[PDB]
C-alpha cells in the first residue's frame, strides 16, 4: 500500500480569508470526503519541495491523515552516511506516526527514517566512537528530537468534539428540543439528566485514561557518557542521540534507551521482552565484516527498558558502549508507538432503508389531515416531528446501558474488577483464546523434585547427600525463588562464623566458611566446610556436567550420562551437577584462609543431579477441558524455546494429535518449509516458528489462511509480532483473546476485543479487564458473562422496538380522528411501564451448566424477525377488530368532531384505546425473555413478575371501578355492562395465543425443515474448512 504527498504553503489575505470563515457552518460535510473540503480551503497548487499542509493523496487508501509542519528555528550519496550535519540550505520536518520525516534537498522526497541497517553501514568505519566530537550537539538533539514519549493530553476541549458527535447522539438533542414545543417537559429533563451523566463519566474516564497512560511511561535517570578528553560528567536521559559512547555502572538499573557493546560483558535480565528469565551473555562486537544488518547479532545487543544484575570490567578505566538505537525507533518505543495513533454495511445499509421505509410510510399520512379533517392552521409542522421523531425510542442505546452496568457490578462482585462498562455483549462470541505458559500457566517459581540418582520425599537417604545438598548455599537465605524452593524443600531452617550455622543435623552443624564469588567466565561456586565432629570435612562445589565430567579424570567418570542429558534437554528439564571432593580438616583450613580454587577444583566426584520443572497450576487442566468441550480452539503463544513449549502443551492433556514442526534452515531469498514429525493425511496441526512467522509475512504465496486455522503452539514470539498475528486473525472476522502478565503484550492487548491480565500492573492500565486472580478459570466465567449480556440485549432491544411499534401504531389509528391519546396518559405510559419493565427484566445471569450452541453474532436471524413480523400483524388485527366491535356497538354519545384540538379528551373512543393498549406493552415483555438454554428460569427470579402482578391489578381495577383514577387521567366514565367482560376475555384470548407462538416459535422446529438445503457460506473460515476436510 503506497502513499504520496502533496500541498501548499498559505496565501495571502484577502477573499480567502473570507471564504475560510465561510466553512465555519457548512462544515458539516467534512466527516465524509475530505477531498472538497481541502481543495475548498487555502490549499492552492504549488511546487512538491514548497509545500506547507501535507497531505495523503488516495494512491490506494482510504481516510486520509492531515497534519501541520513544524517551523524550524534556524534554516541556515552513499545511503544517510550521516546531508545532516550542519544546517543546510532548508530543513523541514512533521510528526507522523510518532518518529518525524526529515527532508532532503539531494532526494527531493520525503525520506523515511530508518537505522544504518538499512544504509548498509560497513563496520569498517564503526567501532571508533570515543565520546562526541566537535560537531554541534543540538543539530543531533533537534533532528532526532527528544528522547521522550510524547503522548497528546487531549483535555477537555480538544476531546469533546472527538467523542461527543455519535449517530445517537444528535437525533437525541432534537428530540429534547422538540419537546420544549409542545410542553411534556418531564420527560424531556430524565433523559437530559442521564446522558448529561453518562457523559461526564465517559469524559472523566478517557482523562483517567490518558493520565494513566501517560504517566505509565516516563525516563528519569543520569547516565555517564565517557567524553573524548579526560573528565567525565553526568547528563540526563533526556539527550541521548545515536553515535554516542555509553558508560554501564557496575550496578545499573533500567535501560534508557538501546545501546551496542564494544568491550566487556554484562548480565541482562530482559523480562519485558521474554518470558523466560534466565540471564543471557552479551559480549562485545569484534568482527570486521560488510555491513551491520542489526538482525544476526542478538547475542551483542542490549533492548530498553532490561535490568544489569552484574558486569565485568575490562581493559581500561572502564567498559565502552555505542547507541545504535534510540528514540520512538528503538524496541521500547515501537511497542508504545504501535497504539497510539493506529487505533459490514451490508446490515446497516438495510437496517437505515427500513428506517426510511418506515419513515416515509408515515410522512404522507400525517399531512392528509386536510382530507378527512381540519387543518389546525399551521400546526401540523410540531405534530409531524413529533410523529418522525417516535418512531423509535430517544432511550434505544441507553436501554441496554443499564443491562451492561448491572453486569459490570455482578463482575466486580468477585473475580475481575471492572474499570468501566463495555466490550460485553461482543464478548460472548469467543471462539479463541491465546495463553502463555510463563506468568499464568504455569508458576513462575521453580521447584526441584529432589535427586534421581543415589549412587520421592526428603530426609529418606541417609549420607553425606543430605550435608552437600543443604550446604551448596552459597548466599545465605536470610541475615532467586529456586535457591529458596530448593532449601524449603528439604525441610530444614535457615537464617566460628557469624550467621553461616546449619541446623536439623543430629551431630554438630556443618558450617561454611567462605563462599567463592560468582563470575561469568567461570560457572564454578565451591563452599568449603569444616566442623569439629570428629569427620573429615569434604568440599562441595556446582557447575555444568559437562565441564566437570571433562575434568574428572583422574577420579572415577559417569557412565551413560549423555542420552539422559539429550533427553532431557529436549524434555526442557535443566542439568546440574553437584560435585565434591573430601578434603582433611588441616589443609581444609589453610585452603579457606588463603582463598585457594586451583587446588580444591582439580579432581572432583559427583553425588547426585538436581533438575527443575515448570509445575503447572493443577486448576488448569479442568479448565482447559471446559473450555475445549465448547468447541473452542485454544492456542499457546510465548517467547520460550518451542522445545519446552512443545512439551508443556503435549503435557497439557488437552488433545495429542499428530504434531510436527518446522526446522529452520539458512537464510535465502527462498525459503522452503519441510515438514517434520513426532504421504497420508491426517490430523495434524500446523506449528510454526519464530523465524519463519516473520519471513512469511512479506510472502504469502499460499498457506496464509490454512495456517491460522490449524495453529496450535507458538515459540520465540517477538512482541511486536503478536500485534501482527492479532491482525492477521482479526482479518476474518474473528474473535482473539489475549490472555497475559507481562508487559510485552500490551499492543496484542489492545488490538483484541478481548483480553485479561493477571497482573495488577503494567498489563491492567492497557487491559480492558483486570483481574485479581492468578488463575486462568476466569475465562468460562467471562464467556458465560458476555453470552448472557447478549442475550438479555437482543431481549432489550425487541421489547423496545415491539413497544415503539405499537406505540406509534396506536397513535397512527387515532391520527384518523382528531385525537392526541392525550398528555397524562402518555406521560404515565412512557414513563411507569417502560422504566418499570425495562430495568427488572435485565437482572439475571447464567446458570453453572455450559452450554454448546451460541448466541447469534448480529440481530439478522429469520426467525426473530418473523415472531416480530407475527406479532406486530396480530396485534394490528386484534386491535383494529376491537375498534370496529366498539364502532358498530351502539354507544351513548357521538364523538364531537369539530375542534381539531386535545381538548375533547372525555369520549368512549379514546378510553377503550388506550386501556386496551395499555395491557399490550406488559403482554409483549413477558414474552420476548429466552428462558432455559441461556437465561436462568423465570420463575427462580421473581423480582419482576411481583411487581408485572400489581401493574395488572392496578390497572384493571382503574379500568373497572369508577372514580379511581379518572380525575387526573383522561378517563371517562363508562355505565356497567357487558363492555368490561368481552375487553377481558379478548385479552385473556390474545395473551394465551401469544403466549402459545412464543412456545412454539422458540423450539425452532421449522428451521431445521427450512435448512434443508440452501448452502450457507457466510463466513470466511468455514468455506476453506470443507474444502479442507475433503481429504
Ligand atoms: F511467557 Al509470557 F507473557 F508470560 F509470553
Ligand atoms: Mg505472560
Given at each position: 500500500?503506497?502513499?504520496?504527498?502533496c500541498?501548499?504553503?498559505?496565501?495571502?489575505?484577502?477573499?480567502?480569508?473570507?471564504?475560510?470563515?465561510?466553512?465555519?457552518?457548512?462544515?458539516?460535510?467534512?466527516?465524509?470526503?475530505?477531498?472538497?473540503?481541502?481543495?475548498?480551503?487555502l490549499?492552492?497548487c504549488?511546487?512538491?519541495?514548497?509545500?506547507?499542509?501535507?497531505?495523503?493523496?488516495?494512491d490506494?487508501?482510504?481516510?486520509?491523515?492531515?497534519?501541520?509542519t513544524?517551523?524550524?528555528?534556524?534554516?541556515?550519496?552513499?545511503?544517510?552516511?550521516?546531508?545532516?550535519?550542519?544546517?543546510?540550505?532548508?530543513?523541514?520536518?512533521?510528526?507522523?506516526?510518532?518518529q518525524?520525516?526529515?527532508?532532503?534537498?539531494?532526494?527531493?522526497?520525503?525520506?523515511?527514517?530508518?537505522?544504518?541497517?538499512?544504509?548498509?553501514?560497513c563496520?569498517?568505519?564503526?567501532?571508533?566512537?570515543?565520546?562526541?566530537?566537535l560537531?554541534?550537539?543540538?543539530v543531533?538533539?533537534?533532528?532526532?528530537?527528544?528522547?521522550?514519549?510524547?503522548?497528546?493530553?487531549?483535555?477537555?476541549?480538544?476531546?469533546?468534539?472527538?467523542?461527543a458527535?455519535?449517530?445517537?447522539?444528535?437525533?437525541?438533542?432534537?428530540?429534547?428540543?422538540?419537546?420544549?414545543?409542545?410542553?411534556?417537559?418531564?420527560?424531556?429533563?430524565?433523559?437530559?439528566?442521564?446522558?448529561?451523566?453518562?457523559?461526564?463519566?465517559?469524559?472523566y474516564?478517557?482523562?483517567?485514561?490518558s493520565?494513566?497512560?501517560?504517566d505509565?511511561?516516563?525516563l528519569?535517570?543520569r547516565?555517564?557518557?565517557?567524553?573524548?578528553?579526560?573528565?567525565?560528567?553526568?547528563?540526563?536521559?533526556?539527550?541521548?542521540?545515536?553515535?554516542?559512547?555509553?558508560?554501564?555502572?557496575?550496578?545499573?538499573?533500567?535501560?534508557?534507551?538501546?545501546?551496542?557493546?564494544?568491550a566487556?560483558?554484562?548480565?541482562?535480565?530482559?523480562?519485558?521482552?521474554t518470558?523466560?528469565?534466565?540471564?543471557?551473555?552479551?559480549?562485545?562486537?569484534?568482527?570486521?565484516?560488510?555491513?551491520?544488518?542489526?538482525?544476526?547479532?542478538?547475542?551483542?545487543?542490549?533492548?530498553?527498558?532490561?535490568?544489569?544484575?552484574?558486569?565485568?570490567?575490562?581493559?581500561?578505566?572502564?567498559?565502552?558502549?555505542?547507541?545504535?538505537?534510540?528514540?520512538?525507533?528503538?524496541?521500547?518505543?515501537?511497542?508504545?508507538?504501535?497504539?497510539?495513533?493506529?487505533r459490514?454495511?451490508?446490515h446497516?445499509?438495510?437496517?437505515?432503508?427500513?428506517?426510511?421505509?418506515?419513515?416515509?410510510?408515515?410522512?404522507?399520512?400525517?399531512?392528509?389531515?386536510?382530507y378527512?379533517?381540519?387543518?389546525?392552521?399551521?400546526?401540523?409542522?410540531?405534530?409531524?416531528?413529533?410523529?418522525?421523531?417516535?418512531?423509535?425510542?430517544?432511550?434505544?442505546?441507553?436501554?441496554?446501558?443499564?443491562?451492561?452496568?448491572?453486569?459490570?457490578?455482578?463482575?466486580?462482585?468477585?473475580?475481575?474488577?471492572?474499570?468501566?462498562?463495555?466490550?460485553?455483549?461482543?464478548?460472548?462470541?469467543?471462539?479463541?483464546?491465546?495463553?502463555?505458559?510463563?506468568?499464568?500457566?504455569?508458576?513462575?517459581?521453580?521447584?526441584?523434585?529432589?535427586?534421581?540418582?543415589?549412587?520421592?520425599?526428603?530426609?529418606?537417604?541417609?549420607?553425606?547427600?543430605?550435608?552437600?545438598?543443604?550446604?551448596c548455599?552459597?548466599?545465605?537465605?536470610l541475615?532467586?525463588?529456586?535457591?529458596?524452593?530448593?532449601?524449603?524443600?528439604?525441610?530444614?531452617?535457615?537464617?566460628?562464623?557469624?550467621?553461616?550455622?546449619?541446623?536439623?543435623?543430629?551431630?554438630?552443624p556443618?558450617?561454611?566458611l567462605?563462599?567463592?564469588?560468582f563470575?561469568?567466565?567461570?560457572?564454578?561456586?565451591?563452599?568449603?566446610?569444616a566442623?569439629?565432629?570428629?569427620?573429615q570435612?569434604?568440599?562441595?562445589?556446582?557447575?555444568?556436567?559437562?565441564?566437570?565430567?571433562?575434568?574428572?579424570?583422574?577420579?572415577?567418570?559417569?557412565?551413560?550420562?549423555?542420552?539422559?542429558?539429550?533427553?532431557?534437554?529436549?524434555?526442557?528439564?535443566?542439568v546440574?551437577?553437584?560435585?565434591?571432593?573430601?578434603?582433611?580438616?588441616?589443609?581444609?583450613?589453610?585452603?579457606?584462609?588463603?582463598?585457594?580454587?586451583?587446588?580444591?577444583?582439580?579432581?572432583?566426584?559427583?553425588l547426585?543431579?538436581?533438575?527443575?520443572?515448570?509445575?503447572?497450576?493443577?486448576?488448569?487442566?479442568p479448565?482447559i477441558?471446559?473450555?475445549?468441550?465448547?468447541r473452542?480452539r485454544?492456542?499457546?503463544?510465548?517467547?520460550d524455546?518451542?522445545?519446552?513449549?512443545?512439551?508443556?502443551?503435549?503435557?497439557?492433556?488437552?488433545v495429542?494429535?499428530?504434531?510436527?514442526?518446522?526446522?529452520?534452515?539458512?537464510?535465502?531469498?527462498?525459503?522452503?518449509?519441510?515438514?517434520?514429525?513426532?504421504?497420508?493425511?491426517?490430523?495434524?496441526?500446523?506449528?510454526?516458528?519464530g523465524?519463519?512467522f516473520?519471513?512469511?509475512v512479506?510472502?504469502?504465496?499460499?498457506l496464509?489462511?490454512?495456517?491460522?486455522?490449524?495453529?496450535?503452539?507458538?515459540?520465540?514470539?517477538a512482541?511486536?509480532?503478536?500485534?501482527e498475528?492479532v491482525?492477521?486473525?482479526?482479518?476474518?472476522?474473528?474473535?482473539?483473546?489475549?490472555?497475559?502478565?507481562?508487559?510485552?503484550?500490551?499492543?496484542?492487548?489492545?488490538?483484541?476485543?478481548?483480553?485479561?491480565?493477571?497482573?495488577?500492573?503494567?498489563?491492567?492500565?492497557?487491559?480492558?479487564?483486570?483481574?485479581?486472580?492468578?488463575?486462568?478459570?476466569?475465562?468460562?466465567?467471562?464467556?458465560?458473562?458476555?453470552?448472557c449480556?447478549?442475550?438479555?440485549?437482543?431481549?432489550?432491544?425487541?421489547?423496545?422496538?415491539?413497544?415503539?411499534?405499537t406505540?406509534?401504531?396506536?397513535?397512527?389509528?387515532?391520527?384518523?380522528?382528531?385525537?392526541?391519546?392525550?398528555?397524562?396518559?402518555?406521560?404515565?405510559?412512557?414513563?411507569?411501564?417502560?422504566?418499570?419493565?425495562?430495568?427488572?427484566?435485565?437482572?439475571?445471569?447464567?446458570?453453572?451448566?455450559?452450554?454448546?450452541?451460541?448466541?447469534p453474532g448480529?440481530?439478522?436471524?429469520?426467525?426473530?424477525?418473523?415472531?416480530?413480523?407475527?406479532?406486530?400483524?396480530?396485534v394490528?388485527?386484534?386491535?383494529?377488530?376491537?375498534?370496529?366491535?366498539?364502532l358498530?356497538?351502539?354507544?351513548?354519545?357521538?364523538?364531537?368532531?369539530?375542534?381539531?384540538?386535545?381538548?375533547?379528551?372525555?369520549?368512549?373512543?379514546n378510553?377503550?384505546?388506550?386501556?386496551?393498549?395499555?395491557?399490550q406493552?406488559?403482554?409483549?415483555?413477558?414474552?420476548?425473555?429466552?428462558?432455559?438454554?441461556?437465561?436462568?428460569?423465570?420463575?427462580?427470579?421473581?423480582?419482576?413478575?411481583?411487581?408485572?402482578?400489581?401493574?395488572?391489578?392496578?390497572?384493571?381495577?382503574?379500568?373497572?371501578?369508577?372514580?379511581?383514577?379518572?380525575?387526573?387521567?383522561?378517563?371517562?366514565?363508562?355505565?356497567?355492562?357487558?363492555?368490561?367482560?368481552?375487553?377481558?376475555?379478548?385479552?385473556?384470548?390474545?395473551?394465551?395465543?401469544?403466549?402459545?407462538?412464543?412456545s412454539?416459535?422458540?423450539?425452532?422446529?421449522?428451521?431445521?425443515?427450512?435448512?434443508?438445503?440452501?448452502?450457507?457460506?457466510?463466513?470466511?473460515?468455514?468455506?476453506?474448512l470443507?474444502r479442507?476436510?475433503?481429504?
Amino acid at each position: 500500500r503506497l502513499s504520496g504527498y502533496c500541498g501548499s504553503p498559505w496565501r495571502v489575505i484577502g477573499y480567502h480569508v473570507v471564504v475560510w470563515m465561510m466553512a465555519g457552518i457548512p462544515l458539516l460535510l467534512f466527516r465524509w470526503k475530505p477531498l472538497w473540503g481541502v481543495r475548498l480551503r487555502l490549499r492552492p497548487c504549488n511546487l512538491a519541495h514548497a509545500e506547507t499542509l501535507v497531505i495523503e493523496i488516495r494512491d490506494k487508501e482510504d481516510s486520509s491523515w492531515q497534519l501541520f509542519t513544524v517551523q524550524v528555528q534556524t534554516e541556515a550519496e552513499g545511503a544517510w552516511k550521516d546531508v545532516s550535519v550542519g544546517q543546510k540550505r532548508v530543513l523541514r520536518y512533521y510528526l507522523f506516526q510518532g518518529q518525524r520525516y526529515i527532508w532532503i534537498e539531494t532526494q527531493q522526497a520525503f525520506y523515511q527514517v530508518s537505522l544504518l541497517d538499512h544504509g548498509r553501514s560497513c563496520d569498517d568505519v564503526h567501532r571508533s566512537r570515543h565520546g562526541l566530537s566537535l560537531q554541534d550537539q543540538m543539530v543531533r538533539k533537534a533532528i532526532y528530537g527528544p528522547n521522550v514519549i510524547s503522548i497528546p493530553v487531549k483535555s477537555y476541549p480538544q476531546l469533546l468534539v472527538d467523542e461527543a458527535l455519535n449517530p445517537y447522539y444528535g437525533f437525541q438533542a432534537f428530540s429534547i428540543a422538540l419537546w420544549l414545543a409542545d410542553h411534556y417537559y418531564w420527560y424531556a429533563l430524565c433523559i437530559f439528566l442521564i446522558s448529561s451523566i453518562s457523559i461526564c463519566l465517559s469524559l472523566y474516564k478517557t482523562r483517567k485514561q490518558s493520565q494513566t497512560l501517560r504517566d505509565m511511561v516516563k525516563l528519569s535517570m543520569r547516565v555517564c557518557v565517557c567524553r573524548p578528553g579526560g573528565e567525565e560528567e553526568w547528563v540526563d536521559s533526556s539527550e541521548l542521540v545515536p553515535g554516542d559512547c555509553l558508560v554501564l555502572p557496575q550496578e545499573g538499573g533500567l535501560m534508557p534507551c538501546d545501546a551496542a557493546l564494544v568491550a566487556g560483558e554484562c548480565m541482562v535480565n530482559e523480562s519485558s521482552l521474554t518470558g523466560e528469565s534466565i540471564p543471557v551473555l552479551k559480549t562485545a562486537l569484534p568482527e570486521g565484516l560488510g555491513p551491520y544488518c542489526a538482525e544476526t547479532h542478538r547475542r551483542h545487543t542490549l533492548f530498553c527498558g532490561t535490568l544489569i544484575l552484574q558486569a565485568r570490567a575490562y581493559v581500561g578505566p572502564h567498559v565502552l558502549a555505542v547507541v545504535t538505537r534510540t528514540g520512538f525507533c528503538t524496541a521500547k518505543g515501537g511497542l508504545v508507538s504501535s497504539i497510539l495513533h493506529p487505533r459490514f454495511y451490508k446490515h446497516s445499509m438495510k437496517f437505515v432503508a427500513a428506517l426510511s421505509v418506515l419513515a416515509l410510510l408515515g410522512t404522507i399520512y400525517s399531512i392528509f389531515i386536510l382530507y378527512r379533517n381540519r387543518v389546525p392552521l399551521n400546526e401540523i409542522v410540531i405534530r409531524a416531528l413529533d410523529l418522525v421523531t417516535v418512531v423509535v425510542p430517544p432511550a434505544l442505546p441507553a436501554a441496554m446501558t443499564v443491562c451492561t452496568l448491572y453486569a459490570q457490578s455482578r463482575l466486580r462482585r468477585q473475580g475481575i474488577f471492572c474499570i468501566h462498562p463495555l466490550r460485553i455483549n461482543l464478548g460472548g462470541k469467543l471462539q479463541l483464546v491465546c495463553f502463555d505458559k510463563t506468568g499464568t500457566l504455569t508458576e513462575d517459581g521453580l521447584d526441584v523434585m529432589g535427586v534421581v540418582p543415589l549412587k520421592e520425599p526428603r530426609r529418606l537417604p541417609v549420607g553425606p547427600l543430605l550435608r552437600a545438598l543443604a550446604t551448596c548455599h552459597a548466599l545465605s537465605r536470610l541475615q532467586d525463588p529456586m535457591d529458596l524452593k530448593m532449601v524449603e524443600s528439604t525441610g530444614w531452617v535457615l537464617e566460628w562464623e557469624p550467621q553461616l550455622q546449619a541446623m536439623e543435623e543430629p551431630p554438630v552443624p556443618v558450617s561454611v566458611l567462605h563462599r567463592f564469588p560468582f563470575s561469568s567466565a567461570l560457572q564454578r561456586m565451591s563452599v568449603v566446610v569444616a566442623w569439629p565432629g570428629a569427620t573429615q570435612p569434604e568440599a562441595y562445589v556446582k557447575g555444568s556436567p559437562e565441564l566437570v565430567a571433562g575434568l574428572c579424570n583422574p577420579e572415577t567418570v559417569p557412565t551413560d550420562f549423555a542420552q539422559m542429558l539429550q533427553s532431557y534437554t529436549a524434555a526442557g528439564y535443566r542439568v546440574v551437577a553437584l560435585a565434591s571432593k573430601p578434603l582433611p580438616t588441616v589443609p581444609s583450613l589453610e585452603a579457606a584462609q588463603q582463598l585457594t580454587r586451583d587446588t580444591v577444583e582439580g579432581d572432583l566426584s559427583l553425588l547426585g543431579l538436581l533438575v527443575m520443572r515448570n509445575l503447572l497450576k493443577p486448576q488448569t487442566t479442568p479448565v482447559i477441558q471446559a473450555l475445549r468441550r465448547t468447541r473452542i480452539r485454544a492456542v499457546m503463544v510465548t517467547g520460550d524455546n518451542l522445545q519446552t513449549a512443545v512439551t508443556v502443551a503435549r503435557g497439557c492433556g488437552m488433545v495429542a494429535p499428530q504434531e510436527h514442526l518446522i526446522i529452520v534452515h539458512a537464510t535465502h531469498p527462498e525459503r522452503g518449509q519441510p515438514a517434520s514429525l513426532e504421504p497420508d493425511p491426517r490430523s495434524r496441526h500446523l506449528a510454526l516458528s519464530g523465524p519463519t512467522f516473520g519471513i512469511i509475512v512479506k510472502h504469502f504465496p499460499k498457506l496464509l489462511p490454512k495456517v491460522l486455522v490449524q495453529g496450535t503452539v507458538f515459540a520465540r514470539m517477538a512482541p511486536e509480532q503478536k500485534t501482527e498475528l492479532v491482525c492477521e486473525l482479526q482479518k476474518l472476522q474473528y474473535c482473539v483473546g489475549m490472555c497475559g502478565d507481562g508487559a510485552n503484550d500490551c499492543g496484542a492487548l489492545k488490538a483484541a476485543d478481548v483480553g485479561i491480565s493477571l497482573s495488577q500492573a503494567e498489563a491492567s492500565v492497557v487491559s480492558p479487564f483486570t483481574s485479581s486472580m492468578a488463575s486462568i478459570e476466569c475465562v468460562p466465567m467471562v464467556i458465560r458473562e458476555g453470552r448472557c449480556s447478549l442475550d438479555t440485549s437482543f431481549s432489550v432491544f425487541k421489547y423496545m422496538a415491539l413497544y415503539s411499534l405499537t406505540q406509534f401504531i396506536s397513535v397512527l389509528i387515532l391520527y384518523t380522528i382528531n385525537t392526541n391519546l392525550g398528555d397524562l396518559q402518555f406521560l404515565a405510559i412512557d414513563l411507569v411501564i417502560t422504566t418499570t419493565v425495562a430495568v427488572l427484566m435485565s437482572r439475571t445471569g447464567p446458570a453453572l451448566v455450559l452450554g454448546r450452541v451460541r448466541p447469534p453474532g448480529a440481530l439478522l436471524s429469520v426467525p426473530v424477525l418473523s415472531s416480530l413480523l407475527l406479532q406486530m400483524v396480530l396485534v394490528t388485527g386484534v386491535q383494529l377488530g376491537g375498534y370496529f366491535l366498539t364502532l358498530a356497538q351502539p354507544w351513548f354519545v357521538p364523538l364531537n368532531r369539530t375542534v381539531a384540538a386535545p381538548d375533547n379528551l372525555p369520549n368512549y373512543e379514546n378510553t377503550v384505546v388506550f386501556s386496551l393498549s395499555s395491557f399490550q406493552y406488559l403482554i409483549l415483555a413477558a414474552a420476548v425473555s429466552k428462558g432455559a438454554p441461556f437465561r436462568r428460569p423465570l420463575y427462580t427470579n421473581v423480582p419482576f413478575l411481583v411487581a408485572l402482578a400489581l401493574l395488572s391489578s392496578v390497572l384493571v381495577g382503574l379500568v373497572l371501578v369508577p372514580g379511581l383514577l379518572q380525575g387526573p387521567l383522561a378517563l371517562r366514565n363508562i355505565t356497567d355492562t357487558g363492555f368490561k367482560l368481552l375487553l377481558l376475555g379478548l385479552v385473556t384470548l390474545n395473551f394465551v395465543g401469544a403466549f402459545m407462538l412464543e412456545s412454539v416459535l422458540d423450539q425452532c422446529l421449522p428451521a431445521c425443515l427450512r435448512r434443508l438445503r440452501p448452502k450457507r457460506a457466510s463466513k470466511k473460515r468455514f468455506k476453506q474448512l470443507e474444502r479442507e476436510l475433503a481429504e
